[PDB]
Design a protein around this nucleic acid. Structure first.
Ligand code: FES
Ligand SMILES: [K+]
Ligand SMILES: [Mg+2]
Ligand SMILES: [Mg+2]
Ligand SMILES: [Mg+2]
Ligand SMILES: [Mg+2]
Ligand SMILES: [Mg+2]
Ligand SMILES: [Mg+2]
Ligand SMILES: [Mg+2]
Ligand SMILES: [Mg+2]
Ligand SMILES: [Mg+2]
Ligand SMILES: [Mg+2]
Ligand SMILES: [Mg+2]
Ligand SMILES: [Mg+2]
Ligand SMILES: [Mg+2]
Ligand SMILES: [Mg+2]
Ligand SMILES: [Mg+2]
Ligand SMILES: [Mg+2]
Ligand SMILES: [Mg+2]
Lengths: 122, 48, 137, 72, 23, 97, 74, 128, 86
RNA sequence: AAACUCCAGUUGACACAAAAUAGACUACGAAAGUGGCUUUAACAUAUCUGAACACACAAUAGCUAAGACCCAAACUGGGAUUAGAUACCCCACUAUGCUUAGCCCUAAACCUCAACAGUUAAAUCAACAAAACUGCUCGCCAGAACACUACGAGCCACAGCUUAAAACUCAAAG
């Protein structure tokens, strides 16, 4: 199916960041993936201190990778990311654009519940 | 119709030949998914 | 400009300076308001112990330590040991819902120290370790 | 009634005008009611669409001197 | 509703479990 | 017979059903600027549908997106990102007074 | 209470009676004790308001049917 | 088992899909789909092979075929998840519901009862 | 621990008014629910007991929210008697 | 009081444990039960009822084997209270709670209110509770106690579970 790889790389120079992206995308193609795009969300400060591969990170580069791949290639790709030191954190999720949103009409009011107790003189 | 639309997009997919070129381009652009909303249900995208 | 109750963020420069110092350089007063005691410890921005006081160190024993008098007495003793080192403005960090949660803050004001901010660091787990069983008293 | 569809649209397009109702007077005609009479009279002519028929009704009142301030 | 009929069965079971442990 | 009798008709004056501010919009876990509009500036706690004003179907989407962005490294847990403190307030809660 | 004065006047004008006040228990079923053994009860009762001030039926509606008195009601 | 290169049930019929790019044919295959798309094709094969009118799906025959594809799916899921007691109950009930279909079919149309038992490899066993 | 310090549950003092700040801080924790949550987490509340309390707290909210809706609906009749004497 | 005092506080590093807020939502599942994130597989039946001759499940506790161990904690020890306290309160610690492979098969397993279909009128209706009824089917109950017992039989269960009486006794029990 169609997946999305939320990748958080390490704060590195451009020469090293390009080698990691290419290294990471070649791993997807080797497992039967069909990459579609490579979006960059920019280098920002992490919401909290992340510790990975005996390193305390405070900044990182956010990159997205939309691609198609079989179901059996997800588990094999999650292991590769773990070994890579440059990758602080990487997770795969089903692409949100492959989930049609049912049209909504509006909020339906709910009337108070009636006939919960017998109409007897207590 | 879906197949035809897909047959056009496949040209833009990354490949081993154009992999290096696409990487550099991504390092030059930026995508912003951040946008707020008001009480009137109106999107407010940041001026950046 | 206006006044905001939100503290200044280190990343963003601010115009609020106390005695020519930034919000980050201000020393910190860690208060631990327990149910039977109240410890106070003042530190600098670089985590350097300046003064330490507690209801026990002031002479109170057993149940008399879990009062607002012993907490205030401990705040005055911590504000007198830190004022000798050049401490005027502090950032309070309370931890716990004990009796001396507010009374200790008063003793610091009665020792010549000015409180610019109040931070709550009470430990709440998001689940965590299972507490002891409920009492029948 | 059949004219309730007309009133619902008039109040939405224009809304109750400055003129205040006089419920005491039995033979009282409101600005909206006057709009219904014309709207229906033009329907007798043969127009079969609401949009054109609705628009033509407002013009007739404006010619008669009625004040029709739309919400916009 | 009271538990007087549960209390009769409570002692019956307790005395029986205590008698088996003894024999 | 008579023509003044009422007719079997649906209510013309009935008003359209109300919609939440997010009706028809896509909630994504990367839009931290939108997700921070529904958390406490001080504790980072998620607000309820009686404060946000959202419907059940959309309040569940904001929650699942916040919990996903917090553990992925996009959004903080204990506090609201100061960068989004000057954003339009859509929640019906007043702390100071 | 809004129409208590109006009704009391009408009864006086038409030479009839009115009871617009709090209805004490036994005005009809226990009348002989309240008024006297030779008292004469109404032959017709007219209810201009069949409800009391708590939005419940007036007690006289039931007490009149007990004493076989016909009632007229709005 | 349908090969992975097989196209989806929906996309095989559209015209012009015979001459397209190889990448577009690999995205519309069973390789880039879930397990439930391969089962929609397994069912299609049995209908043409066994049922007289493939289009009709409400007939007692088709219901047996639709259910026999689910039974095989549960056995492949239980071969890897032995401690999944939920799917082990759906299997034993589905096997009992198919037997109730085969009983009503053997009592009405014995000519087709033999066809389904042969096509799907089923052996009706009289209960003890 | 891993988050930035002095950004959560922090309140600044205005004109050395510590009292007004402490009341504000204690009102933010109460409205968010931390205060009550910290008190129940002192001793372990077993599931059965926690499910009995949530049902009690939810039935109290309903009743208290409907009575107040009737008080504000009848407060309009708290005026003087217009038919004084009848 | 005892205990601790290679303790306490600030900071940093740091889980095979447990899963704030959202939830004022009321969803999923046959029930048990299920509320941190991601992915994979995946939630029977085109009439209904239907197995206490069978099959598959079944909270917690507990048994067997191998591991993990922050915290909690039967047992036990100490302190205190008490006429005594084998308890209620305080401290410490163990089995156990977790993982894996098997067993055990119990509950106020109760929303004590069976499944399918259908009704709101008549006598609505002992009382209380969560208003009163129809059709059809399966299951179950026939005074209290003896009795979640004895015997018999079956079961990886051996101080066990399931099925389950009798004699004597009472004029009440409920
Ligand atoms: S009302 Fe349409 S999505 Fe909330
Ligand atoms: K119950
Ligand atoms: Mg009672
Ligand atoms: Mg007994
Ligand atoms: Mg059945
Ligand atoms: Mg059964
Ligand atoms: Mg069990
Ligand atoms: Mg165990
Ligand atoms: Mg312990
Ligand atoms: Mg002892
Ligand atoms: Mg242990
Ligand atoms: Mg346990
Ligand atoms: Mg239960
Ligand atoms: Mg029962
Ligand atoms: Mg049944
Ligand atoms: Mg009996
Ligand atoms: Mg038992
Ligand atoms: Mg037995
Ligand atoms: Mg035996």
């Amino acid at each position: 199916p169609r997946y999305e790889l939320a990748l958080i790389l390490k704060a590195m120079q451009r020469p090293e960041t390009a080698a990691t992206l290419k290294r990471t995308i070649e791993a997807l193609m080797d497992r039967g993936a069909i990459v579609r795009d490579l979006e960059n969300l920019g280098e920002r400060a992490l919401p909290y201190r992340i510790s990975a591969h005996s390193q305390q990170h405070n900044r990182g580069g956010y990159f997205l990778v939309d691609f198609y791949a079989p179901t059996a290639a997800v588990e094999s790709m999650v292991e590769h990311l773990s070994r890579d030191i440059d990758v602080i954190r990487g997770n795969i999720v089903k692409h949100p654009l492959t989930q049609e949103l049912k049209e909504c009409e509006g909020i339906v009011p709910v009337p108070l519940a009636e006939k919960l107790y017998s109409t007897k003189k207590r | 119709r879906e197949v035809l639309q897909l047959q056009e997009e496949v040209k833009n997919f990354i490949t081993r030949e154009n992999l290096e070129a696409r990487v550099e381009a991504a390092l030059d652009s930026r995508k912003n998914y951040n946008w707020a909303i008001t009480r009137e249900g109106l999107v407010v995208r940041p001026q950046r | 400009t206006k006044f905001s109750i939100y503290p200044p963020i280190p990343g963003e420069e601010s115009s609020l300076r106390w005695a020519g110092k930034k919000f980050e350089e201000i020393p910190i007063a860690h208060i631990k308001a327990s149910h039977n005691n109240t410890q106070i410890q003042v530190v600098s921005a670089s985590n350097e112990p300046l003064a330490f006081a507690s209801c026990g160190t002031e002479g109170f024993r057993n149940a008399k330590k879990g009062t607002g008098i012993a907490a205030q007495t401990a705040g005055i003793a911590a504000a007198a040991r830190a004022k000798q080192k050049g401490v005027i403005h502090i950032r309070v960090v309370v931890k716990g819902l004990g009796p001396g949660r507010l009374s200790a803050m008063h003793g610091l004001i009665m020792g010549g120290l000015e409180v610019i901010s109040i931070t709550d660091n009470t430990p709440i787990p998001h689940x965590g370790c299972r507490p002891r069983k409920a009492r029948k008293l | 009634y059949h004219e309730d569809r007309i009133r619902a649209k008039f109040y939405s397009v224009y809304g109750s005008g400055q003129r205040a109702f006089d419920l005491f007077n039995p033979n009282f005609k409101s600005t909206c009611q006057r709009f219904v009479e014309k709207y229906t009279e033009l329907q007798k002519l043969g127009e079969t669409d609401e949009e054109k028929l609705f628009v033509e009704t407002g013009k007739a009142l404006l010619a008669e001197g009625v004040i029709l301030r739309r919400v916009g | 509703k009271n538990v007087l009929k549960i209390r009769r069965r409570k002692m019956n079971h307790h005395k029986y479990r205590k008698l088996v442990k003894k024999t | 017979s008579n023509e003044d009798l009422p007719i079997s008709m649906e209510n013309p004056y009935k008003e359209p059903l109300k919609k939440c501010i997010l009706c028809g919009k896509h909630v994504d876990y990367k839009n931290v600027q939108l997700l921070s509009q529904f958390v406490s500036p001080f504790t980072g706690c998620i607000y309820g549908r009686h404060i946000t004003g959202l419907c059940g179907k959309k309040q569940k989407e904001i929650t699942k997106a916040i919990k996903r962005a917090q553990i992925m490294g996009f959004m903080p847990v204990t506090y609201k990102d100061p960068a989004y403190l000057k954003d339009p307030k859509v929640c019906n809660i007043r702390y100071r007074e | 209470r809004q129409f208590s004065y109006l009704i009391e006047n009408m009864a006086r004008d038409c030479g009839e009676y009115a009871h617009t006040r709090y209805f004490r228990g036994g005005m009809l079923t226990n009348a002989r004790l309240l008024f006297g053994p030779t008292v004469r009860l109404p032959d017709l009762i007219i209810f201009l308001h069949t409800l009391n001030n708590i939005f419940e039926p007036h007690v006289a509606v039931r007490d009149a049917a007990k004493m076989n008195i016909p009632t007229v009601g709005i | 088992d349908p090969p992975p290169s097989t196209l989806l049930k929906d996309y095989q019929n559209v015209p012009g899909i015979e001459k397209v790019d190889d990448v577009v044919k690999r995205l519309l295959s069973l390789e880039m789909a879930n397990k439930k798309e391969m089962l929609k094709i397994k069912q299609e094969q049995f209908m043409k092979k066994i049922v007289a009118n493939p289009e009709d799906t409400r007939s007692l025959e088709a219901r047996i075929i639709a259910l026999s594809v689910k039974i095989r799916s549960y056995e492949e899921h239980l071969e890897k998840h032995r401690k999944d007691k939920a799917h082990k109950r759906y299997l034993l009930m589905s096997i009992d519901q198919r037997k109730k279909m085969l009983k009503n079919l053997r009592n009405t149309n014995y000519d087709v009862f033999e066809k389904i038992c042969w096509g799907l490899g089923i052996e009706y066993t009289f209960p003890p | 621990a891993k988050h930035l310090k002095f950004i959560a549950r922090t309140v600044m003092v205005q004109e050395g008014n510590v009292e007004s700040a402490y009341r504000t801080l204690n009102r933010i924790l109460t409205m968010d629910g931390l205060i009550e949550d910290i008190k129940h987490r002192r001793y372990y509340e077993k599931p059965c007991r926690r499910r009995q309390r949530e049902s009690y707290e939810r039935c109290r909210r309903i009743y208290n929210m409907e009575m107040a809706r009737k008080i504000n609906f009848l407060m309009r009749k708290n005026r003087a008697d217009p038919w004084q004497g009848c």
